[PDB]
Design a protein around this motif. Structure first.
Motif, short mmCIF file in Angstrom:
data_model
loop_
_atom_site.label_atom_id
_atom_site.label_comp_id
_atom_site.label_asym_id
_atom_site.label_seq_id
_atom_site.Cartn_x
_atom_site.Cartn_y
_atom_site.Cartn_z
N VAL B 288 0.82 -1.21 0.00
CA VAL B 288 0.00 0.00 0.00
C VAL B 288 0.85 1.27 0.00
N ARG B 289 1.68 1.41 1.02
CA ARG B 289 2.49 2.62 1.19
C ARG B 289 3.70 2.69 0.24
N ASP B 293 1.71 4.77 -2.61
CA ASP B 293 1.73 6.20 -2.30
C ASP B 293 2.10 6.94 -3.58
N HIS B 344 -2.67 -7.80 7.04
CA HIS B 344 -3.27 -6.81 7.94
C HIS B 344 -4.47 -7.36 8.73
N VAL B 370 -4.92 6.36 14.62
CA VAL B 370 -4.55 6.92 13.32
C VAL B 370 -3.48 6.06 12.63
N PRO B 375 -3.71 0.96 6.13
CA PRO B 375 -4.00 1.98 5.11
C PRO B 375 -4.90 1.51 3.97
N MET B 376 -5.36 0.26 4.02
CA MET B 376 -6.43 -0.20 3.13
C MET B 376 -7.43 -1.00 3.96
N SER B 377 -8.66 -1.11 3.46
CA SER B 377 -9.67 -1.96 4.09
C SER B 377 -9.86 -1.71 5.58
N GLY B 378 -9.69 -0.46 6.01
CA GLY B 378 -9.75 -0.11 7.42
C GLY B 378 -10.86 -0.76 8.24
#
Ligand code: HEM
Ligand code: HEM
Ligand code: 9OS
Ligand code: 9OS
Ligand code: H4B
Ligand code: H4B
Ligand code: MTL
Ligand code: ZN
Lengths: 407, 411
Positions: B288-289, B293, B344, B370, B375-378
């Motif tokens: 993801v990052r 990004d 995750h 936070v 950072p995906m599928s929170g």
């Protein structure tokens, strides 16, 4: 005391001056941040009235005018005599718009100035409330071309004459606990449904039963009404590639219309102020459909897709999640019902934020709520530092009326 | 004062008493929350109460509070502080401290692992060549041919602030980035500045898309020196997709060992400015990052084209679709090569259990929502629905300024 927020993707720094005007408490202290916690007299009235009137008159380029001083004087007199005071229509509209503008959890605030305000302060009975609510629904729905609106019922007096909409949203689905032990319909709405039944609603015990309105006027006992079925716009959910998706029996309603919040303007409290905008796709597809304590359909969808649900590492949940959200947006667009995807919406919020910093000195924002519940870091708000603080006028939470109600 | 947290998915309510032990500040006030803000030479004066607070915690943890050994140690430390203006930790205290800094790291989702940390004592180190040897050993131990083991190597503590040990790299292993004259970037844009420093310092750059950076090591406040990690110690994983055969031709790979090397470790008022540590990756850090990004490798478009998604309108969710496939590929590739990684879902599920265990046995678990939420599928992970309380405990890992901004060059 003067604060900078950085966007870590663009390197843009913004400077916040607006937070200084903050009045209400955050729940945080220097020793503890409560950022992820969901819910952290005539003497009191006039400074609030004053603070409001000051910002209103500043907004119309008439600060320190005789009209300003006159009104301030007039309101002060009215508070002394009556213990409360009545907002002018201009002030009510300004206040309602600014409550939305100030909503730090709302990603849709670029729209804040375009809000239709329906003054229902002349309402006296629950039957009147029903009429006003039907009119709101029809106006806001607009055959699928949704228009933001709020309907404002009489303000709190002594607290024993409150107007309340007992429903959490004007349009929502019932929930029933089964003997089979499961939940039929929306688990979120079990308690409220039970209250409807106790009051006499005849429930069709289905999965997607639009709940009746439970309306309370003048602190009197609440009454039941059924929104005319023809004013409730709903959307059958289908997928553009998966022919089988329609067989899931899913649908949702077009109009998100929150009815349980309290609107505070100039120290006056409006306990009944249903408002509506339009949906961001993820509200339905991620939360309403995929939350475990909601409709919770991930497993079923995963199966129809024939995914390896053996191991979490196949990301089968993440795959089903995307497809469900594709279907939601596809379905609304196909039926020409206003909806916005989370990419478009967060991009709009960044532009709004920049506007607000530029023209107002800041924009209170709650990152925990602003960042969408899927694909967080591929949306620009993820990388945007935000400052959260409370400005008035404001929308506030309030207790559910049944825990309060002296029947 | 008791504080409650609620999980809105399970209605489980936990009670926090540990926040009472919080001393350091958050950044927030009763008027403003700074929860989304990334970043909101000591006197003997302040030093002894800090040492004493730590030693009390240490001796309680070993059930020797108020013991003669406890009292003698306090006495010994006070004398050492008043005569030498600092003090030295026992090996036992150092190990305890490093493990607790990790346990206390409110931004870390991997803390269920906190008690299993290999501590390498490098306080006898004197030169950059010495630091290089220690770091090579850390990398080899931690890597363990793909069976990753958490570890931390601890270099000498700060004295006057003019003799700091520092690792100038942000991570022990990281890819170079090169800004091109046309404004485009080759490699990792996150590391452009550090890459330029290395080049200026003498590094001969291959100028490829995945060049492992040399170590830039500062011992005892001296100018830093360049070393190249032996390539045979750098485990890397070529990225492929289980169903998509064109994915390999994207030319992607990543390193196996995430080893953060720019943090400061505080234990009992002592400051360890060089304390590289490593665990293993959660898949989204890479997929993801690092990959997706916009300011990093930024591969979403290319992937999306190869999947032939509708890229004309965002509402097709093409980015979301590609994001999942990329993250599947990262997890698939690491598992296939038998290199430790956690998805995750597993990691957040484990964190919830850890957090609940910590509430019961410790009275709390400070956590930064936070950062904890992936950072995906929170919201399809259990941490999204969990209320958390963020506060600062010591021992702790802290941010420090980049050394090129503070270093006094000897020449
Ligand atoms: C016009 C399109 C709009 C969009 C797309 C939008 C979007 C959103 C979203 C996604 C949320 C988070 C809701 C949740 O996760 O439960 C939210 C919250 C909120 N919205 Fe907006 N909104 C819109 C209009 C409005 C309007 C017209 C008002 C008021 C006049 C408003 C007031 C609020 C408030 C007070 C919250 C926080 C609610 C809470 O704390 O529970 N929104 N909005
Ligand atoms: C064992 C497996 C581990 C996993 C899966 C893990 C996972 C993570 C992740 C995903 C983050 C967020 C990083 C980011 O988004 O930049 C993080 C942050 C952090 N981790 Fe862990 N970690 C592990 C081990 C460790 C160890 C061994 C330490 C120290 C001894 C540690 C200390 C920290 C600290 C201090 C942060 C905050 C970093 C910051 O503020 O920039 N972690 N961890
Ligand atoms: C206090 O928060 C909760 C507590 C318990 N359950 C659920 C919740 C969620 C609160 C629901 N707020 C939901 C909302 C409010 C305003 C909106 C405006 C526009 C829009 N599209 N959606 C909204 C959605
Ligand atoms: C304040 O830090 C920043 C600010 C802006 N951009 C980037 C950064 C870097 C944040 C990097 N955090 C990086 C980290 C730290 C410890 C870890 C432990 C285990 C693991 N798997 N990953 C970690 C990853
Ligand atoms: C515990 C946490 O605060 C809670 O799950 C929040 C997270 N962020 C959210 N964000 C939005 N927009 N809506 C929500 O209901 C929530 N729930
Ligand atoms: C502005 C915001 O605080 C910033 O983008 C944060 C958000 N949450 C994060 N969470 C993790 N794990 N890592 C990060 O780098 C960030 N970045
Ligand atoms: O190019 C240098 C960067 O890698 C460096 O400044 C890091 O972003 C910083 O050390 C934070 O981790
Ligand atoms: Zn806070």
């Amino acid at each position: 005391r003067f604060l900078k927020v950085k966007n870590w993707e663009t390197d843009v720094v913004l400077t916040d001056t607006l937070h200084l005007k903050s009045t209400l408490e955050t729940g945080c202290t220097e020793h503890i941040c409560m950022g992820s916690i969901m819910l952290p007299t005539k003497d009191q009235l006039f400074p609030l009235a004053k603070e409001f009137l000051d910002q209103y008159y500043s907004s119309i380029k008439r600060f320190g005018s005789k009209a300003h001083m006159d009104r301030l004087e007039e309101v002060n007199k009215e508070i002394e005599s009556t213990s409360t005071y009545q907002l002018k229509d201009t002030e009510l509209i300004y206040g309602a718009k600014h409550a939305w503008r100030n909503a730090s959890r709302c990603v849709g605030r670029i729209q804040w100035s375009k809000l239709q305000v329906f003054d229902a302060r002349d309402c006296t009975t629950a039957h009147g409330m029903f009429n006003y609510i039907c009119n709101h629904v029809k106006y806001a729905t607009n055959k699928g071309n949704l228009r933001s609106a709020i309907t404002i019922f009489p303000q709190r007096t002594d607290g024993k004459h409150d107007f309340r909409v007992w429903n959490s949203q004007l349009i929502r689905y019932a929930g029933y606990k089964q003997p089979d032990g499961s939940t039929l319909g929306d688990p979120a709405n079990v308690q409220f449904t039970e209250i409807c039944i106790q009051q006499g609603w005849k429930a069709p015990r289905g999965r997607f039963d639009v709940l009746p309105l439970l309306l309370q006027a003048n602190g009197n006992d609440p009454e039941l009404f059924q929104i005319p079925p023809e004013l409730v716009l709903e959307v059958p959910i289908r997928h553009p590639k998966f022919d089988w998706f329609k067989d899931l029996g899913l649908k949702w309603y077009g109009l998100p219309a929150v009815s349980n919040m309290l609107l505070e303007i100039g120290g006056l409290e409006f306990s009944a102020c249903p408002f509506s905008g339009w949906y961001m796709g993820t509200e339905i597809g991620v939360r309403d459909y995929c939350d475990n304590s909601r409709y919770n359909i991930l497993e079923e969808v995963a199966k129809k897709m024939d995914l390896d649900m053996r191991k979490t590492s196949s990301l089968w949940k993440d795959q089903a999640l995307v497809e469900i959200n594709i279907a939601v947006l596809y379905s609304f667009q196909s039926d020409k019902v206003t909806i916005v995807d989370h990419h478009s919406a967060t991009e709009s919020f960044i532009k709004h934020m920049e506007n607000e910093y530029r023209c107002r000195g800041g924009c209170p924002a709650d990152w925990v709520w602003i960042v969408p519940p899927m694909s967080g870091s591929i949306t620009p708000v993820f990388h945007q530092e935000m400052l959260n603080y409370r400005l008035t006028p404001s929308f506030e939470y309030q207790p559910d009326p049944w825990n309060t109600h002296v029947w």
